[PDB]
RNA sequence: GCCACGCGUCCAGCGCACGGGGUCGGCGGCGAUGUCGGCUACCCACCCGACCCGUCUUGAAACACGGACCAAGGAGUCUA
RNA sequence: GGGACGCUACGCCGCGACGAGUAGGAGGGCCGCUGCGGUGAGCCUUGAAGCCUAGGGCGCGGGCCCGGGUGGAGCCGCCGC
């Protein structure tokens, strides 16, 4: 019973610790800590009484059954995967929409979500785009930037929130959202010339345009 | 048994070699020492140009 | 009953857990030792040419004991002759690869296949790609990695050969015991070289591969491996 | 709807296409069915570049997906009913077919003792 | 015995048929119906065999005694279970298991009963 | 390509015994069990004059 | 409102002289004509767009008579900014000189 | 920076994982009279390759011989 | 002193290495035809053999099983010969 200290050793390298064993016995001061050494229920029936047994015998067997797989150990469910990020990806910056019905639209990135998908909102009086998700590797990261820092996200919206639930109907939930987080935004977008024009403009390759040749 | 390559499967040079994590535990702090000292030399050669 | 022989296996999966234990401090230590003999065998080399030349005088190197020998050339006509040492050599695939130790006997079969093979001295590095990577044990006349060192163990332990590090030790260095070290690896399956190949029927002097690059085969088994 | 196997492998196939006799196509005495050219002058039997492919050992399925039906069943030759209570423990892995010279009646004896056993039939409603 | 009879009865036997590359028994107690040493029903001194009950509702139990080897007409006994799936499959691994009969077959007998009776269960 | 010869590379040796009874098979049996369960090289020379032809395994006089 | 897909050709099967590989495109985009300007058009997924006679479904919209042939860019092809391609299914030969589009959405920026 | 942890006498459990060969405890769509899928086998188009078989021969696509096409028969058998 | 599969042991499983071919030799054929002794309480005028087939398939292959049409009276699987 005690309170738990971090990770003394500082990582260095992944699978290296900054400390040796033997410095770490010294930090650890391990010289001075030597150490040296369900299923019957018994129930009443109105006779007598009866000890039932939970998890009974299956009624049922099937004529051939799979053996069972070797152990991984390396292999772990989504939900627990390491989500990256490109550093020209920054909250603040100007996305393009590639493969959604948003087709060539400019897109304002706001934060990154948990399962790694990116919250990507441009104001719906410009872009007509609500708060959507957008996948990273469909994204063209624009290198223009506005300051989001000083602007409230709300809490209660996240990657359940935006879950597909089973005709499609705007809710009124939504509708609030939409304009919570716009008019933090709108205004911040206004303070640099000719943005808004930007934002509703649509992007599209013309002749003699070369993505690799051009930087953006 | 899938014959991991020791070079770029650290935990199997580890297997191999116990060694390996002091070869690999220097040579980091070394280098960064050694980066460390090249940064100081250019930050106090700013000193030498300037007076 | 069963009071003592549970115990007593409890006890003995003990014992092998120390015994574990305490073999890995010993490969950790010989792996030391080990980098420390290449401070003092790297260093008394540059040691030696310099206090001769502050002398005046000139520093000849000792003649390297070991090369590493690649067959180049493929299969489809040769001398009988020149087959009997190719084969001699474990070298019977186009680009294989084995480690040999120089004396009068190897130099003159070494001669006598030039234009089949391209050898020359490795490094100190080059061992370490090569054992590590494509080192593969013959046990029980089978091609079997190296992916633990009791398996160099359980046929070289009576050599004090009991890791990958005394293996490579026993290579680098030609101890008394390199016969049985180099014996017990399998000959090294290269791929193709990386970047092309400048000629392959003509010696290395004359532009080409073949014949003895002596320490231009580090960068030939960069390559390969 | 149907009855599946216990396991649903990926069935592959190194080569679908038949192996047809050399010549079969400019005569029609020559039949489809593969004959090993014995020639001197025989370009096929020499491998030569461009032509008929021979049969060999390395065109051989995999022994787990061997016989094995894109349904993930093997198949098993059934002339009567009797011959059907042979697969219920053989169920989830080999399905059983009705022989060609089977009567109708007899047909119509098979199929629902294969319902009850869950035994699956490649070839149920065959004459109807 | 059972390894001199296992013998003779592997190739030449009525009981064995052999196509489309599969190789099966038919004999009265040869439960998982392959042709193999252990699940033969004629082979051995001691078998298990199970078979769908004579009306249609439940399973036959066949039990083989030690005492007629050479007559087949006492050597047999046969036990009907009527009873609910989870009392059936208990009753089969108790004759098998505390009896010391056999044991090998202990589950695969569990195995051809509970399909029997997933036989005999009303179809949808 | 590699340089060598696959004139002798299947050693020719009896595997199991050409005759189809089945005494002998049974006796066979037993004894590829106890050559390779033992350590005794009697039950691997036993089993390998099993699979011997009969002008192989001479008869032996009183 | 505009095109979102680089133009390139298909100029031919992975080959040698007198034996051809048809199981690896060479693609020809447009605007690169060096090996170090491929670097970004590598792992972009390329599309062959076609249209037959009977009609197949397409997704979000009305079924159609147009087909694809999907595929990846994998890796750079010579030294004048060709480049290999990789598809799903192996081109057809009635494709040679023709325009196939290269997408951008596998983007790495 | 450290593969070093105790005393006297004589000369063990918890979780993390570059760790004995892949998983997701991750998702999006369309599917009843016009849609999905169907290696092979029916037909057609394109690229690459590609000389008609047998036999004698050191050498055959040969301007070396048999050969319009198809069906049936048709050639190491038996005794010692 | 209360518990998955297995093992036609002529069966199953694990490791490594190798795979050309004329004449020629050997082995394996649950490749194919015909008849005989056994065997399938085998198939069959509610449709046998044979034949055709733009269908579904299996086996590397010799070949084989179903679907459809024609046909009207025999036929096949396995163990040996």
């Given at each position: 019973?005690?309170?738990?200290?971090?990770?003394?050793?500082?990582?260095?390298?992944?699978?290296?610790?900054?400390?040796?064993?033997?410095?770490?016995?010294?930090?650890?001061?391990?010289?001075?800590?030597?150490?040296?050494?369900?299923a019957t229920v018994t129930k009443p029936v109105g006779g007598g009484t009866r000890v039932v047994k939970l998890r009974k015998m299956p009624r049922y067997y099937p004529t051939e059954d799979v053996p069972r797989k070797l152990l991984s150990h390396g292999?772990?469910?989504?939900?627990?995967?390491?989500?990256?990020?490109?550093?020209?990806?920054?909250?603040?910056?100007?996305?393009?929409?590639?493969?959604?019905?948003?087709?060539?639209?400019?897109?304002?990135?706001?934060?990154?979500?948990?399962?790694?998908?990116?919250?990507?909102?441009?104001?719906?009086?410009?872009?007509?785009?609500?708060?959507?998700?957008?996948?990273?590797?469909?994204?063209?990261?624009?290198?223009?930037?506005?300051?989001?820092?000083?602007?409230?996200?709300?809490?209660?919206?996240?990657?359940?929130?935006?879950?597909?639930?089973?005709?499609?109907?705007?809710?009124?939930?939504?509708?609030?959202?939409?304009?919570?987080?716009?008019?933090?935004?709108?205004?911040?977008?206004?303070?640099?010339?000719?943005?808004?024009?930007?934002?509703?403009?649509?992007?599209?390759?013309?002749?003699?345009?070369?993505?690799?040749?051009?930087?953006? | 048994?899938?014959?991991?390559?020791?070079?770029?499967?650290?935990?199997?040079?580890?297997?191999?070699?116990?060694?390996?994590?002091?070869?690999?535990?220097?040579?980091?702090?070394?280098?960064?020492?050694?980066?460390?000292?090249?940064?100081?030399?250019?930050?106090?050669?700013?000193?030498?140009?300037?007076? | 009953?069963?009071?003592?022989?549970?115990?007593?296996?409890?006890?003995?999966?003990?014992?092998?857990?120390?015994?574990?234990?305490?073999?890995?401090?010993?490969?950790?230590?010989?792996?030391?030792?080990?980098?420390?003999?290449?401070?003092?065998?790297?260093?008394?080399?540059?040691?030696?040419?310099?206090?001769?030349?502050?002398?005046?005088?000139?520093?000849?190197?000792?003649?390297?004991?070991?090369?590493?020998?690649?067959?180049?050339?493929?299969?489809?006509?040769?001398?009988?002759?020149?087959?009997?040492?190719?084969?001699?050599?474990?070298?019977?695939?186009?680009?294989?690869?084995?480690?040999?130790?120089?004396?009068?006997?190897?130099?003159?079969?070494?001669?006598?296949?030039?234009?089949?093979?391209?050898?020359?001295?490795?490094?100190?590095?080059?061992?370490?790609?090569?054992?590590?990577?494509?080192?593969?044990?013959?046990?029980?006349?089978?091609?079997?990695?190296?992916?633990?060192?009791?398996?160099?163990?359980?046929?070289?332990?009576?050599?004090?050969?009991?890791?990958?590090?005394?293996?490579?030790?026993?290579?680098?260095?030609?101890?008394?015991?390199?016969?049985?070290?180099?014996?017990?690896?399998?000959?090294?399956?290269?791929?193709?070289?990386?970047?092309?190949?400048?000629?392959?029927?003509?010696?290395?002097?004359?532009?080409?591969?073949?014949?003895?690059?002596?320490?231009?085969?580090?960068?030939?088994?960069?390559?390969?491996? | 709807?149907?009855?599946?196997?216990?396991?649903?492998?990926?069935?592959?196939?190194?080569?679908?296409?038949?192996?047809?006799?050399?010549?079969?196509?400019?005569?029609?005495?020559?039949?489809?069915?593969?004959?090993?050219?014995?020639?001197?002058?025989?370009?096929?039997?020499?491998?030569?570049?461009?032509?008929?492919?021979?049969?060999?050992?390395?065109?051989?399925?995999?022994?787990?997906?061997?016989?094995?039906?894109?349904?993930?069943?093997?198949?098993?030759?059934?002339?009567?009913?009797?011959?059907?209570?042979?697969?219920?423990?053989?169920?989830?892995?080999?399905?059983?077919?009705?022989?060609?010279?089977?009567?109708?009646?007899?047909?119509?004896?098979?199929?629902?003792?294969?319902?009850?056993?869950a035994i699956r039939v490649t070839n149920p409603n065959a004459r109807l | 015995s059972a390894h001199l009879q296992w013998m003779v009865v592997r190739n030449c036997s009525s009981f064995l048929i052999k196509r489309n590359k599969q190789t099966y028994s038919?004999?009265?107690?040869?439960?998982?119906?392959?042709?193999?040493?252990?699940?033969?029903?004629?082979?051995?001194?001691?078998?298990?065999?199970?078979?769908?009950?004579?009306?249609?509702?439940?399973?036959?139990?066949?039990?083989?005694?030690?005492?007629?080897?050479?007559?087949?007409?006492?050597?047999?006994?046969?036990?009907?279970?009527?009873?609910?799936?989870?009392?059936?499959?208990?009753?089969?691994?108790?004759?098998?298991?505390?009896?010391?009969?056999?044991?090998?077959?202990?589950?695969?007998?569990?195995?051809?009963?509970?399909?029997?009776?997933?036989?005999?269960?009303?179809?949808? | 390509?590699?340089?060598?010869?696959?004139?002798?590379?299947?050693?020719?040796?009896?595997?199991?015994?050409?005759?189809?009874?089945?005494?002998?098979?049974?006796?066979?049996?037993?004894?590829?069990?106890?050559?390779?369960?033992?350590?005794?090289?009697?039950?691997?020379?036993?089993?390998?004059?099993?699979?011997?032809?009969?002008?192989?395994?001479?008869?032996?006089?009183? | 409102?505009?095109?979102?897909?680089?133009?390139?050709?298909?100029?031919?099967?992975?080959?040698?002289?007198?034996?051809?590989?048809?199981?690896?495109?060479?693609?020809?985009?447009?605007?690169?004509?060096?090996?170090?300007?491929?670097?970004?058009?590598?792992?972009?997924?390329?599309?062959?767009?076609?249209?037959?006679?009977?009609?197949?479904?397409?997704?979000?919209?009305?079924?159609?008579?147009?087909?694809?042939?999907?595929?990846?860019?994998?890796?750079?092809?010579?030294?004048?900014?060709?480049?290999?391609?990789?598809?799903?299914?192996?081109?057809?030969?009635?494709?040679?000189?023709?325009?196939?589009?290269?997408?951008?959405?596998?983007?790495?920026?």
């Open positions: 019973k005690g309170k738990p200290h971090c990770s003394r050793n500082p990582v260095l390298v992944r699978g290296i610790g900054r400390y040796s064993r033997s410095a770490m016995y010294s930090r650890k001061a391990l010289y001075k800590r030597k150490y040296a050494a369900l292999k772990k469910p989504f939900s627990q995967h390491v989500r990256k990020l490109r550093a020209s990806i920054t909250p603040g910056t100007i996305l393009i929409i590639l493969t959604g019905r948003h087709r060539g639209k400019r897109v304002v990135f706001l934060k990154q979500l948990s399962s790694g998908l990116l919250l990507v909102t441009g104001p719906l009086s410009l872009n007509r785009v609500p708060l959507r998700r957008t996948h990273q590797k469909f994204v063209i990261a624009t290198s223009t930037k506005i300051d989001i820092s000083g602007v409230k996200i709300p809490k209660h919206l996240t990657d359940a929130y935006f879950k597909k639930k089973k005709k499609y109907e705007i809710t009124e939930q939504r509708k609030v959202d939409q304009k919570a987080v716009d008019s933090q935004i709108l205004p911040k977008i206004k303070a640099v010339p000719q943005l808004q024009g930007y934002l509703r403009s649509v992007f599209a390759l013309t002749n003699g345009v070369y993505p690799h040749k051009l930087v953006f | 048994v899938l014959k991991k390559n020791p070079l770029k499967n650290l935990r199997i040079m580890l297997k191999l070699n116990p060694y390996a994590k002091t070869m690999r535990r220097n040579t980091i702090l070394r280098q960064a020492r050694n980066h460390k000292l090249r940064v100081e030399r250019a930050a106090a050669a700013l000193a030498a140009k300037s007076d | 009953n069963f009071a003592e022989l549970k115990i007593k296996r409890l006890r003995k999966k003990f014992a092998q857990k120390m015994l574990r234990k305490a073999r890995r401090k010993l490969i950790y230590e010989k792996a030391k030792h080990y980098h420390k003999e290449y401070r003092q065998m790297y260093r008394t080399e540059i040691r030696m040419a310099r206090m001769a030349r502050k002398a005046g005088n000139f520093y000849v190197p000792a003649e390297p004991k070991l090369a590493f020998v690649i067959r180049i050339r493929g299969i489809n006509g040769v001398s009988p002759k020149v087959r009997k040492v190719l084969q001699l050599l474990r070298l019977r695939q186009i680009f294989n690869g084995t480690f040999v130790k120089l004396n009068k006997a190897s130099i003159n079969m070494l001669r006598i296949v030039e234009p089949y093979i391209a050898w020359g001295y490795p490094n100190l590095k080059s061992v370490n790609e090569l054992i590590y990577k494509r080192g593969y044990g013959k046990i029980n006349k089978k091609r079997i990695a190296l992916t633990d060192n009791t398996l160099i163990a359980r046929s070289l332990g009576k050599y004090n050969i009991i890791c990958m590090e005394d293996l490579i030790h026993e290579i680098y260095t030609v101890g008394k015991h390199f016969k049985e070290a180099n014996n017990f690896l399998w000959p090294f399956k290269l791929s193709s070289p990386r970047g092309g190949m400048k000629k392959k029927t003509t010696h290395f002097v004359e532009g080409g591969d073949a014949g003895n690059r002596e320490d231009q085969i580090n960068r030939l088994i960069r390559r390969m491996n | 709807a149907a009855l599946r196997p216990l396991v649903k492998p990926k069935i592959v196939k190194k080569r679908t296409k038949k192996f047809i006799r050399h010549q079969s196509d400019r005569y029609v005495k020559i039949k489809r069915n593969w004959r090993k050219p014995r020639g001197i002058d025989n370009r096929v039997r020499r491998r030569f570049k461009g032509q008929i492919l021979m049969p060999n050992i390395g065109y051989g399925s995999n022994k787990k997906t061997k016989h094995m039906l894109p349904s993930g069943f093997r198949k098993f030759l059934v002339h009567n009913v009797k011959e059907l209570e042979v697969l219920l423990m053989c169920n989830k892995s080999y399905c059983a077919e009705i022989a060609h010279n089977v009567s109708s009646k007899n047909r119509k004896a098979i199929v629902e003792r294969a319902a009850q056993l | 038919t004999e009265p107690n040869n439960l998982k119906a392959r042709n193999s040493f252990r699940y033969n029903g004629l082979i051995h001194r001691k078998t298990v065999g199970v078979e769908p009950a004579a009306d249609g509702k439940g399973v036959v139990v066949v039990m083989k005694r030690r005492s007629g080897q050479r007559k087949p007409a006492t050597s047999y006994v046969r036990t009907t279970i009527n009873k609910n799936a989870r009392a059936t499959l208990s009753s089969i691994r108790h004759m098998i298991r505390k009896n010391k009969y056999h044991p090998d077959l202990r589950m695969a007998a569990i195995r051809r009963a509970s399909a029997i009776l997933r036989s005999q269960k009303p179809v949808m | 390509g590699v340089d060598i010869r696959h004139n002798k590379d299947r050693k020719v040796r009896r595997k199991e015994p050409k005759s189809q009874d089945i005494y002998l098979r049974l006796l066979v049996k037993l004894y590829r069990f106890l050559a390779r369960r033992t350590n005794s090289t009697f039950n691997q020379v036993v089993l390998k004059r099993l699979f011997m032809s009969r002008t192989n395994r001479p008869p032996l006089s009183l | 409102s505009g095109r979102l897909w680089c133009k390139a050709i298909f100029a031919g099967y992975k080959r040698g002289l007198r034996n051809q590989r048809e199981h690896t495109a060479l693609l020809k985009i447009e605007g690169v004509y060096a090996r170090d300007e491929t670097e970004f058009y590598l792992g972009k997924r390329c599309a062959y767009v076609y249209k037959a006679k009977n009609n197949t479904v397409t997704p979000g919209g009305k079924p159609n008579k147009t087909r694809v042939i999907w595929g990846k860019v994998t890796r750079a092809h010579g030294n004048s900014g060709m480049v290999r391609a990789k598809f799903r299914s192996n081109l057809p030969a009635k494709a040679i000189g023709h325009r196939i589009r290269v997408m951008l959405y596998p983007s790495r920026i």
